[PDB]
Design a protein around this ligand. Structure first.
Ligand SMILES: CCCCCCCCCCCCC/C=C/[C@H](O)[C@H](N)CO
Ligand SMILES: CCCCCCCCCCCCC/C=C/[C@H](O)[C@H](N)CO
Ligand SMILES: CCCCCCCCCCCCC/C=C/[C@H](O)[C@H](N)CO
Lengths: 252, 238, 275, 58, 275, 58, 60, 60, 275, 58
């Protein structure tokens, strides 16, 4: 059957046995930048094995009262090997991604996640005329968490699930490349995400390309003898990463 | 020069004009064009994507995510009503703020079929059946499962394939309805009933959750532009 | 000439084919036609998705701002007015543009100018026809600081002159962005250390307009109010996104107060009773 | 330098004339007759496509 | 080029042919030519039924309503005016349309605007040229409730702006019905239980117009009165019916008082006496 | 894109020129030269038609 | 631009005008057309139908 | 004459206009043209010449 | 359609070729491409040097002078005005022309006329529309010395008449020089003994304009101020020269006070400190 | 007597119509489409030209 899928990128391999399918972007597969759409004049850097490979982020715990999580993604891979180093030494970056999310249960557990991959998720603030600190939009490989009600913390994102931090209807948030992790059919959700920007290359510190969002619509539920701890693991692999404008290390 | 005569409509400004006007920056070199994935040529491409329906908008469930959860469980006898709403994509409170409801609320006439997709988000060891009925108007709302199976329906058996499609057929007097409410173009009622109950084994939770989706079919249309009744501002955005 | 899909006839079925059974967990929208579930007839359908295209949806003139200035005052700053150009101070054109993330369009700009005689003791005048000047300054140019300032000469800056009672002034404007599309949303900072300002306010940078009366000090005050109408034409649009539920607050950020998802029903099942 | 094209008429029952007058393409009228679409990148955005009669997640 | 029928010559007849004897009980109108009864000559007739066609009979501009509004008032509702669109408040265009049951036509709308200075103590003014705004709202849109209301922006609604002294404003309007013809008569109810309203008032649903002055509060009142002229063009018409004998009463129903069939003679036979 | 057609003149004793200027067919002038008719559905609206010399209800 | 000269009759409104005017709703999709029995192309089709004459219009 | 309709932008003066206007001196015999060395067709011809940079602009 | 040069790919090099080593002492600008020093890729470049040509750089309308005159005065010289024609009283168009030494262009002249009612005791008038006259006098013609002077007849001199409220007056003017180019700089004297005047003031000799009101003495003073806009078209230009550093002083000479070469830095080496 | 030429459009993705109306060439519009250049008289203004790889003052 087509439920078993194997993905190899570099020296890292994922074998799944209850997959659903693979969503590829807006139909476009990630490729390198051609000479007609180019702007910069010098030779790029294509590592292609030491960069294009699966990196595993932190596992998050999914209780019955969990609301959702988000990661900003050119910035969650800041300290992930030679991808993060090549981010630190160059000025212009350009890559696509492969986002694989693991969550397992048994046939006695129920629940349903929505894994969305949203371009340009410019988020709102908890206090309206106030500036958000960078530690709340992103935290690296550590997830930020939505809240169930109207949050009003200082220098923080408005954390409500029914507005997704952006002021929209959370049910209408499926216009983006998405899958579901339904615990009675699924085990994982693979999303191939190409490069989307208004410019051909961009800096990978000053800009946030997209935002993964994992939101449980059907709440997690189980009986009085089943397992309580259910983790959720996100694994990311850059694809067709190239780099331009080499200079010293830093971001300022 | 050339003798000419001015008609009515001269020296006016119509908002829907389609004329030619001089450029304020002649010979301006426009930047080149780049292939960006996800180009939209029609809002009807957007309106054909499934999106989740808040069926459970009942008295402060809207200020949470519980408005999307349709509660379902084991029953005592059989044949009770699960939920129900009226087929008004843009006037009904259920599918008002949904994506089809937004795009249709930028229009005044609509036409074509509607898909409703229902996902069962319970456990792998639970079974059940449902009756997903559509009833054209002329009578009222069907009051039991006996009156509900006299219209367009489908029996959905919950198994490995986790989602069903009730495709609402376009059955109308005219070619177009109205997006706002009137008695003349009334469309009917979407209702859902227990065919058989939810039988579950021991040490498994009983109460489960159905999610609902809506989109348009490939014969769908919208006709008359207007402003959306959702935009309400008072002052400027200084 | 592109029609919608015809409805094809069908008959009874009894087989292992299942068009109605699918899986929405793959991010896939099912392609189910009404001839897959019920028996349909043959309908030759002549409807055209014409007035729903991205060109016909956005190419309508919309008021973006109101500009007010006078013709004689004690303070010189109330005799002229200025406006930093954005499309994000009126909610209708803003919400119509924010269906997409990136856009590429030419602009067609139309000004509607009206003058009202202010209340004074000497209203019995005979005023000759007022002439207005609208100067566009590309980003970086010099700024006029009075109505009699010598920066109103327009040797290189674009300008338009209108006498009272004519047609509204109209000019066309090409695609002016330094990138490949007008970015409606920018998720990022202005400084490389991830400080500064957060949002699309870094990527506005469009210049600003200036408004005055070409006539000199009159002997009675008259308040002019000019309304700017943008018309996006030659439209391309990419990567759509859900419409905004919440009411806007400001022009520079995207912030809000949380709003309920839809209107409440107070029940969950319909009936033939008072519904 | 004239261009002749059909008008928007109804079904079951034309030929306007256009000449461009300005040196720039930003002066031209709106292209209000492009009625094509492709919802294959929003609907059906998957690898290993589905055949609508198979169980598809079989 | 379609002529009327020629008159053909005839001679004496004596036979069993009977063109003059017929039976009107079959609903049949006899096709009797004057060359069937009397001796006629040959007349080559060049008359053309040209100015009696359904296009030439209806395509004339007709005043449908008068709209009145002012420029300064104590109450805000008398500074603007509105009109629910029908063709059934002036009897000439109504009676010309009610020859048929169903019609299909494009409309050509022309406004004629005149302003009159109201009586006041301060009539010695110098008023600049008044500018008027006519906004059309399709059925369901938001309604302005003041002259300074923000629903007058016309981002999507059609509008027209006219300065005083120009030509009258004119625009074309296509066939806007949700059915296949404008139903002049609707014999039926609004509700399925045969209650509600009876008549064509269910099928009007055409939108409504709005009128104000773009200028602000002036220092003297001026009453504008704008007249709407419809012109039906591109005309098709079906299933004719007799003209109305009786005087109309209202716009929403068809009700009347009974009227005599024609004018009385007081005798029945003519004579060479005082007739 | 011009169209030439005859004018309305009298008998026993032309060729105007028209160019359409707008993209829509609702902008065109009135079709005031269609002079055809058919009173066969109002007069003679019967089955088993009558031959005008026969007694016809003979 | 092009030198032109205005004739008498400019900027007037005649009721029997036959000119062209812009549409207030561009590219509006008109509903399809249906064959309905009893189409009239001329009022002279109507005037050729027999109809009853009130000859006895004498004093009430 | 010919029926016409005025658009917005009529009777205005734009600085970047590119229209045609009548001559105030008709049939004026312009003097002949002479080949002069150093004709410029583009300011980018001028901008490609090396020129000395004042790097030491330090306090008088 | 002339593109800029493409960037060609290169690889490593180790040879006796030296593109970076040259000699600027020969007056030669090195033709070094970035693919001569570092490794570059292939870039297909679509930029066009379009808006930098000598035609597009100069062909913009620029205000050259302001002319003021009245409609009733005690002295007759303030009821009319005159202007000896030069392009050297406004610094923007002067500095844009002085990139070159010799130029050859046709001129497009546009006048913008505004009138302001002067302060008086009898401001409550009803003035009919003012008509202005602009007479050009070729060098040597007779000069009007009053507003009612008979030299305003324009039998041979070019003239233009403008009624208030219309479009601005515009006429075209050919190349009018007695030499082969408008000499922007003339290094030389006027007399053969090397005395007289030094500079370009010998080669101006373009004629002069005259301005009045065609109307007679009005019963209230009105100040007209007309602005002259030149537009150089059909442009040829020769032998370029550096732009002017220093501020101008006069129209007839080139004299100045010395100005520093650029803005000071107060240090000579950059750092990551407060620079 | 009409002349048809291309418009200024961008790259990677026209034909206006011009008729001259006046008897003089000083009335014509600006020639804003001459994009040619030659910096061989300002750069490289020397006798015995240089070949860019030779030491050139060798
Ligand atoms: C006086 C003559 C020139 C008139 C100048 C008026 C407007 C000039 C700016 C062009 C308009 C661009 C407006 C903004 C476009 C995009 O929507 C925004 N960048 C955001 O998407
Ligand atoms: C301001 C620009 C738009 C102007 C809008 C004016 C009128 C809009 C409505 C179109 C006119 C249709 C009038 C009614 C037609 C039919 O005769 C009736 N439905 C009854 O037959
Ligand atoms: C009233 C109708 C005629 C209007 C006359 C206005 C101006 C007549 C003179 C033509 C303009 C030439 C201006 C000077 C051109 C050159 O730039 C200078 N000689 C210096 O280069």
């Amino acid at each position: 059957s087509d439920r078993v899928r194997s993905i190899t990128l570099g020296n890292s391999t994922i074998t799944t046995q209850e997959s659903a399918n693979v969503v590829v972007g807006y139909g476009v597969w990630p490729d390198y930048l051609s000479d007609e759409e180019a702007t910069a004049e010098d030779q790029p850097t294509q590592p292609d094995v030491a960069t294009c490979r699966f990196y595993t982020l932190d596992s998050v715990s999914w209780m019955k009262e969990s609301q959702g999580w988000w990661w900003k993604f050119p910035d969650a891979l800041r300290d992930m090997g030679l991808f993060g180093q090549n981010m630190q030494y160059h000025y212009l970056g350009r890559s696509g991604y492969t986002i694989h999310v693991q969550c397992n249960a048994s046939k006695f557990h129920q629940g349903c996640l929505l894994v969305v991959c949203v371009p340009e998720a410019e988020m709102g603030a908890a206090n309206i005329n106030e500036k958000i600190n960078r530690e709340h939009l992103s935290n690296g490989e550590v997830a930020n968490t939505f809240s169930g009600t109207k949050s009003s913390n200082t220098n923080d994102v408005q954390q409500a699930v029914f507005n997704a931090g952006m002021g929209v209807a959370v049910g209408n948030l499926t216009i983006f490349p998405h899958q579901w992790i339904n615990l009675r059919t699924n085990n994982c959700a693979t999303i191939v995400m190409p490069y989307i920007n208004s410019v051909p290359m961009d800096n990978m510190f000053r800009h946030y390309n997209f935002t993964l969002m994992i939101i449980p619509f059907a709440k997690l539920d189980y009986a009085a003898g089943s397992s309580t701890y259910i983790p959720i693991t996100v694994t990311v692999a850059p694809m067709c990463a190239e780099y331009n404008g080499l200079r010293l290390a830093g971001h300022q | 020069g050339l003798p000419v005569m001015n008609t009515p409509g001269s020296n006016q400004f119509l908002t829907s004009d389609d004329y030619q006007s001089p450029t304020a920056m002649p010979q301006f070199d426009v930047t080149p064009e780049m292939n960006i994935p996800g180009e939209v040529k029609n809002l009807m491409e957007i309106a054909e994507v499934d999106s989740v329906v808040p069926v459970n908008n009942v008295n402060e469930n809207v200020n949470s995510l519980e408005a999307y959860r349709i509660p379902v469980h084991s029953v005592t006898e059989t044949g009770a009503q699960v939920f129900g709403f009226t087929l008004q994509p843009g006037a009904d409170t259920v599918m008002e703020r949904t994506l089809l409801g937004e795009i249709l609320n930028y229009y005044a006439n609509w036409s074509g079929s509607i898909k409703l997709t229902f996902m069962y988000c319970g456990s792998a060891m639970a079974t059940g059946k449902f009756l997903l009925a559509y009833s054209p108007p002329g009578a009222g709302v069907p009051k039991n499962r006996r009156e509900a199976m006299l219209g367009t329906h489908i029996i959905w058996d919950i198994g490995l394939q986790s989602s069903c499609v009730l495709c609402v057929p376009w059955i109308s007097q005219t070619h177009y309805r109205f997006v706002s409410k009137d008695i003349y173009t009334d469309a009917g009622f979407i209702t859902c009933w227990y065919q058989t109950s939810i039988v579950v084994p021991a040490e498994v939770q009983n109460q489960s959750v159905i999610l609902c989706f809506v989109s348009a079919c490939n014969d769908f249309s919208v006709r008359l532009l207007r402003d959306s009744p959702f935009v309400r501002q008072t002052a400027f955005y200084q | 000439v592109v029609r919608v899909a015809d409805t094809m006839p069908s008959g009874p079925s009894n087989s292992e084919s299942i068009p109605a059974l699918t899986a929405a967990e793959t991010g896939h929208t099912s392609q189910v036609v009404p001839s897959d579930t019920i028996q349909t007839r043959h309908v030759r359908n002549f409807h055209v998705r014409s007035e729903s295209s991205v060109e016909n949806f956005l190419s309508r003139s919309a008021c973006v701002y109101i500009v007010e200035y006078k013709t004689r005052d004690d303070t010189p700053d109330k005799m002229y007015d200025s406006w930093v150009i954005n499309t994000r101070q009126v909610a209708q054109l803003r919400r119509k543009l924010e269906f997409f993330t990136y856009v590429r369009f030419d602009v067609e700009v139309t000004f509607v100018i009206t003058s009202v005689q202010d209340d004074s003791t000497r209203q019995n005048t005979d005023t000759p026809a007022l002439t207005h000047q609208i100067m566009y300054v590309p980003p970086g140019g010099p700024i006029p600081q009075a109505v009699d300032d010598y920066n109103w000469q327009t040797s290189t800056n674009p300008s338009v002159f209108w006498t009272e009672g004519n047609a509204p002034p109209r000019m066309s404007i090409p695609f002016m962005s330094v990138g490949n599309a007008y970015s409606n949303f920018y998720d990022g900072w202005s400084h490389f250390s991830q400080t500064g300002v957060y949002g699309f306010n870094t990527l506005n940078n469009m210049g600003k307009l200036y408004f005055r009366h070409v006539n000199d000090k009159t002997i009675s005050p008259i308040t002019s109010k000019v309304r700017i109408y943008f018309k996006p034409k030659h439209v391309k649009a990419w990567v759509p996104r859900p419409p905004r539920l919440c009411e806007y607050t400001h022009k520079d950020n995207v912030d809000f107060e949380p709003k309920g998802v839809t209107t409440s029903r107070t029940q969950l099942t319909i009936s033939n009773s008072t519904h | 330098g004239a261009q002749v094209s059909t008008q928007k008429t109804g079904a079951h029952e034309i030929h306007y004339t256009n000449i461009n007058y300005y040196k720039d393409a930003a002066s031209n009228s709106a292209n209000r007759q492009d009625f094509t679409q492709d919802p294959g990148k929003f609907t059906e955005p998957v690898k290993d496509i589905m055949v609508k009669s198979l169980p598809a997640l079989n």
